[PDB]
Amino acid sequence: MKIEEGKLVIWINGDKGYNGLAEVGKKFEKDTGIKVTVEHPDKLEEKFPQVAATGDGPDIIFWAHDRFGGYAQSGLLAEITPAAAFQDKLYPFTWDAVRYNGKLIAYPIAVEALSLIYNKDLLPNPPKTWEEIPALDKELKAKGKSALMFNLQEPYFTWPLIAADGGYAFKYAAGKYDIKDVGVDNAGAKAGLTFLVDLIKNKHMNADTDYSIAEAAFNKGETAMTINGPWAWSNIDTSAVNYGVTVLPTFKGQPSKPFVGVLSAGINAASPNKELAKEFLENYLLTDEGLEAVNKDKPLGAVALKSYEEELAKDPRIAATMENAQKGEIMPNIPQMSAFWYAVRTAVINAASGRQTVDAALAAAQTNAARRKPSWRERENNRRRERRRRAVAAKIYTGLRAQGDYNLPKHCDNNEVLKALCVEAGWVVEEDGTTYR
Amino acid sequence: KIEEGKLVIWINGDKGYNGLAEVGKKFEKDTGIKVTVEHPDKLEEKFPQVAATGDGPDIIFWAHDRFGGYAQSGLLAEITPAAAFQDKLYPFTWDAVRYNGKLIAYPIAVEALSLIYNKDLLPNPPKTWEEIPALDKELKAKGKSALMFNLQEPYFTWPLIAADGGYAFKYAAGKYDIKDVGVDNAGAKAGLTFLVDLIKNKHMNADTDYSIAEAAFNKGETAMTINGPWAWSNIDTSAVNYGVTVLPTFKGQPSKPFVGVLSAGINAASPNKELAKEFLENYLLTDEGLEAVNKDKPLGAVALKSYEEELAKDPRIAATMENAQKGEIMPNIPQMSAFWYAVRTAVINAASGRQTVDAALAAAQTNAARRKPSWRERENNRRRERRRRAVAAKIYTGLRAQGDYNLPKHCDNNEVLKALCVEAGWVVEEDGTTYR
DNA sequence: TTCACAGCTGTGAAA
DNA sequence: TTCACAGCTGTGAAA
Ligand SMILES: OC[C@H]1O[C@H](O[C@H]2[C@H](O)[C@@H](O)[C@@H](O)O[C@@H]2CO)[C@H](O)[C@@H](O)[C@@H]1O
Ligand SMILES: OC[C@H]1O[C@H](O[C@H]2[C@H](O)[C@@H](O)[C@@H](O)O[C@@H]2CO)[C@H](O)[C@@H](O)[C@@H]1O
């Protein structure tokens, strides 16, 4: 797909209220006559950087703020130019989440933080620590239930426990994130991941559990607790589960530290509709009625627009969400964040599966998250150097075959021509390559 | 991984997995086994990869066409149905799920694509593909569109490619001949050229996938879509008054869908083979069980003769079977996977403009039977090149050690090769050109 | 930082 | 069928 003048195409993740956002698009079409299409393709955060480099992709992309720094360093996003008057309608810290190299590269929409979600009837008084979790699962499995199930395939859901005792992604120091100071391999992170693996070894959780499995189970009533964000509440509401949203348990006495995400809307640098996209975002979506319609579909969390957030903050689920947020940290938006997420994802999955030890899986994730990504030019330099090396050899052997008269078979490899060269120069070469004068 | 006394089930995400969950819990009551139903992504791809390591599901629900490559790799337990039991299901279902005189899965439901249309926007559905462009120009003025369907999966486009003569593997002399592929003939070309021309004239979008097609129809923005019985439940919950009818004709010929028999083969590495056959023979393929799955997302024309009597009355099933009769059952042979991939690549590359229709289908025709190199073959290659490097590395190691050439402190083997050339009375130029 | 050999697989040649 | 160089990137050495 390419962005066409006169229409808007939006990409938002499949767990967000895309139907609600589509309704906001219809009003935009009614007031101004521009068609708005909302789509939720899988792996949209990976698809966008691929297509958008060529000028393809949607007009607007929705994702947590951590992915956008990479998008901006690749020149995939337009610079956001809201008047000062409009910026003041959004909390300053949400603008910070979409600031990169001094510039605003997206519109903040809502603040997202994981929370503990528990079945009140199946578990009154939910656990306050992670350590009492195996004990609470013994009693529950008695009733044929499980204690806790959440997504183990995306490190987002495990990071709160890894960060509890001291794990961290990139150390902040002197006003910037140090991309060489990674904390996925320290004692705190090892302790968090070990306690997770010990739950699986001791059968209190299964390592194959993904988002849908963990969802299905809590909404059906087969587990007392789950870990999820505000988007998941709407589906629980329609189930026959009486649930609450509370602080995440402590680990080794310390609070769980979820990585906080700001759902943000970036404008594709190739869109011929930047003014329309800005009009749609500033004066339709980021309004009380715009966010409400999306919010009614799947809760957004703590929205960035002050006016509608003072209404949503009355909700005790949002207060809990922000209680967990306060204990965590805003995600960095630097380009290396995708490299940190890939490394930790591989680590958690390998350790959860027994394919690697915790110490080994995290040591590799530390090296991967810190790994210097070579530039296109460096890649090109390397490619050209090996191209030159082969061609020089090819010419040497091309010439050695033409003028050599080396008593060679009709077809044979360079290794044989080299052998014949060796004997002409006064060497003997065994079959295995051992060579001496 | 599998653990004895439990039952984990894999089935595609567009089927009534929750309905099978309701069936799984009643299997608990009688036999006490806890059953879980998971709907993973690309399960027809993940299964042939994870099965060797013993990782995998007890049961896989999928269309029959891929099981022949599965069974030929040894991933499924051959099925042992009583002669009574074959008689309890239609003989042509067993025929589709049989490779090499052995029964690899249990037939469950017959699936065929049909035209689904919004009566309020289109009381009379078009009988031909050719009138769809004009019909779209009409509905566009009303802010609607004529037709949207999944262009990413060739299953949905194949009916139009087959209409004017396109075929996969010509069945001749009692077997499918992989020497006779018809993805490159004039009928296939005409079928794809028309589909691309719909896109070139902005009557369809090359990027439309299953999700985009379903939303646009269920929301009433498009007047028609092409889909199977599973999609009906979501239209039901929608506010759209829909009909299910015969597919449009192309150049006066019917649309020829590939008919799939949803089958259920058994994990050759499962420790619950007969603990699961209780499910497959005496629980799922029963009138009461198929009802639970059909209640969630409709199965289509089930293979149980008993329940198909009641469901065949449904005018939607009759249309589904009306389209089925005009098409063909899919081959179940191993080359199917390579045929689907080749056709998937042709459709997408022609829809996107990346390739002309001629170039795309010409590439597909050669790929549809391309042989996958065996593991041993790959290992032969790997070992050959390992041998080649070690021989050269030993030569250059000996030259560097005993050669006493006038070489830089650190240099590549090419530099050593040159100093060995000049020693043999050759002159090597800068760029490698070499003579005596 | 640049650099060179390893390494596996791809293209297509020689049967 | 086997075979061989191409081709790009990985690992790790030497500054
Ligand atoms: O798991 C790594 C993943 O974490 C975050 O993604 C979240 C997203 O922020 C939420 O809105 C929700 O959709 O769940 C996602 C995890 O499945 C990061 O934003 C993302 O970049 C990262 O890959
Ligand atoms: O698109 C190629 C694909 O077609 C069929 O897949 C169908 C499947 O049979 C249906 O049950 C449903 O899931 O829709 C699918 C199309 O997306 C073949 O069964 C499959 O082998 C083939 O790859």
Author numbering:
A (entry chain C): -348 to 88
B (entry chain D): -347 to 88
What do the authors of the reporting publication say about this deposited model?
However, single cis‐elements enriched in brassinosteroid‐induced genes do not support binding of either redox form, nor does BIL1/BZR1 DBD heterodimerize with PIF4 DBD on these elements. These findings highlight the complexity of brassinosteroid transcriptional regulation beyond DNA‐binding specificity and redox modifications.
The plant‐specific transcription factor BRZ‐INSENSITIVE‐LONG 1 (BIL1)/BRASSINAZOLE‐RESISTANT 1 (BZR1) regulates the growth of Arabidopsis thaliana via brassinosteroid signaling, acting as both a gene repressor and activator. Its upregulation requires environmental cues mediated by PHYTOCHROME INTERACTING FACTOR 4 (PIF4), with oxidative modifications via H2O2 enhancing their interaction. However, the nature of the tripartite complex of cis‐elements, BIL1/BZR1, and PIF4 under redox changes remains unclear. Here, we demonstrate that oxidation of the DNA‐binding domain (DBD) of BIL1/BZR1 alters its DNA‐binding ability.
